[PDB]
Amino acid sequence: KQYIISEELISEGKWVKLEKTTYMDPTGKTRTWESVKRTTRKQTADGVAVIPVLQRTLHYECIVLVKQFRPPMGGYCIEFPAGLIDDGETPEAAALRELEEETGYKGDIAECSPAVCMDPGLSNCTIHIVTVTINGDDAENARPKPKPGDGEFVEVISLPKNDLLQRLDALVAEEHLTVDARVYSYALALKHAN
Amino acid sequence: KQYIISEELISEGKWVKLEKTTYMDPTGKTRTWESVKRTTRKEQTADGVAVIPVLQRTLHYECIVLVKQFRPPMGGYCIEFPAGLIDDGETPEAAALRELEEETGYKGDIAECSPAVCMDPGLSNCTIHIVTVTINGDDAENARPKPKPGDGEFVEVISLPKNDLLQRLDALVAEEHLTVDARVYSYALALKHA
Ligand SMILES: CCCc1nnc(NC(=O)c2ccccn2)s1
Numbered sequence: 001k002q003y004i005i006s007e008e009l010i011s012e013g014k015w016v017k018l019e020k021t022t023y024m025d026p027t028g029k030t031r032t033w034e035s036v037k038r039t040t041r042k043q044t045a046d047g048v049a050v051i052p053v054l055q056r057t058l059h060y061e062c063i064v065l066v067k068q069f070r071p072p073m074g075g076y077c078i079e080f081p082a083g084l085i086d087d088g089e090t091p092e093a094a095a096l097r098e099l100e101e102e103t104g105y106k107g108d109i110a111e112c113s114p115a116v117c118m119d120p121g122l123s124n125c126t127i128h129i130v131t132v133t134i135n136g137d138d139a140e141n142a143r144p145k146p147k148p149g150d151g152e153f154v155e156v157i158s159l160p161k162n163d164l165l166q167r168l169d170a171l172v173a174e175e176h177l178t179v180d181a182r183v184y185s186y187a188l189a190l191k192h193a194n
Numbered sequence: 195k196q197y198i199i200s201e202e203l204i205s206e207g208k209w210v211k212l213e214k215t216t217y218m219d220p221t222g223k224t225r226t227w228e229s230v231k232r233t234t235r236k237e238q239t240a241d242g243v244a245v246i247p248v249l250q251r252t253l254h255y256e257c258i259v260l261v262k263q264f265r266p267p268m269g270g271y272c273i274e275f276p277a278g279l280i281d282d283g284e285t286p287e288a289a290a291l292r293e294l295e296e297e298t299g300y301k302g303d304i305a306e307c308s309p310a311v312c313m314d315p316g317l318s319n320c321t322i323h324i325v326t327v328t329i330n331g332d333d334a335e336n337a338r339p340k341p342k343p344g345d346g347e348f349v350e351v352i353s354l355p356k357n358d359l360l361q362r363l364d365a366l367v368a369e370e371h372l373t374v375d376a377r378v379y380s381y382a383l384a385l386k387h388a
């Protein structure tokens with residue numbers, strides 16, 4: 001019943017473009033929307049985000065997160081490890097790779113989502129969310145070695161799964177970091193579960 | 195260490211702008227980013243809200259109330275938490291309750307309100323409050339409720355049991371060609387992981 005009729009390019013950068021979408025609303029009226037797209041997508045999705053469950057015996061399970069400066073935010077943010085899927089990469093493979101580059105941890109795939117939207121009122125951006133467990137007791141994850149690219153500066157922050165929400169709320173109150181909405185949503189459901 | 199040096203407008207639509215962001219990396223080098231921003235953000239603590247609406251009813255499993263809408267930037271239908279931008283001077287909590295009633299017909303009760311969290315911080319500055327609201331489904335106010343969609347809003351309400359959310363979302367994606375929101379999916383994953 002609703003559909004896209006055309007897309008007019010407004011402005012194209014190296015990484016991002018702005019478009020004006022014309023679409024048919026369900027009353028049979030023609031309408032417009034300003035839409036953002038990345039210029040990098042081919043793939044299943046633009047990117048992956050990794051939910052990395054650090055499992056170590058006799059310890060609480062941790063969720064491994066990363067803190068970085070985000071120029072669009074003008075501030076530091078706390079996020080799941082994430083990045084863009086290389087052309088010819090699978091989502092699962094991008095997840096292990098990104099997880100290694102950003103944290104040094106080497107992990108195992110548990111499940112992978114279908115492509116899910118990031119901010120669908122604004123952009124077409126999508127990701128796979130890939131749940132990964134990290135055997136924290138193996139020697140490869142003893143002194144994890146982050147292999148970050150040129151210009152990436154990432155701090156690793158592992159927080160306990162069973163108090164995640166309170167821990168994030170603290171980082172926000174006390175560090176003026178911004179927590180990512182997917183990370184916050186995850187933390188909320190850990191509390192809301194039964 | 196890192197901070198914004200300058201923000202140079204590239205292209206402004208009525209709703210969205212692209213900016214060339216210049217910032218200082220932690221080595222001391224000047225770098226650039228392409229950044230998206232909304233034009234609508236005021237003194238609001240955030241662009242918007244998303245509502246986690248827990249429908250509670252005697253002798254019923256709790257449900258999460260979701261909405262399905264056409265999203266022009268996506269070219270397709272998306273399943274999301276009820277959500278809208280915060281009006282000038284409106285509180286996040288008022289906005290949440292109001293968007294919830296407008297989009298679903300339900301009258302909720304505030305449970306909790308997050309700090310401002312980032313929607314896609316490598317791309318945009320957009321932020322929301324995630325507002326958890328309970329809905330007393332035994333109250334007559336919430337018996338056979340009508341959405342009051344604004345101008346050009348066409349929303350369908352989908353209520354799924356909290357205890358099976360992830361499988362129910364996976365089934366919808368299997369039978370329907372629709373996209374699930376990344377927040378909704380993250381929340382459904384944590385409900386399983388707990
Ligand atoms: C990032 C959001 C981009 C938008 N582009 N177009 C938008 N139109 C409206 O909100 C609207 C205007 C007139 C009648 C009905 N709805 S919002």
Ligand SMILES: [Cl-]
Binds near residue numbers: 131133387
């Ligand atoms: Cl798990």
Ligand SMILES: [Mg+2]
Binds near residue numbers: 081
């Ligand atoms: Mg990354």
Ligand SMILES: [Mg+2]
Binds near residue numbers: 083084149
């Ligand atoms: Mg990378």
Ligand SMILES: [Mg+2]
Binds near residue numbers: 276277278293297
């Ligand atoms: Mg809305």
Ligand SMILES: [Mg+2]
Binds near residue numbers: 277
């Ligand atoms: Mg609305």
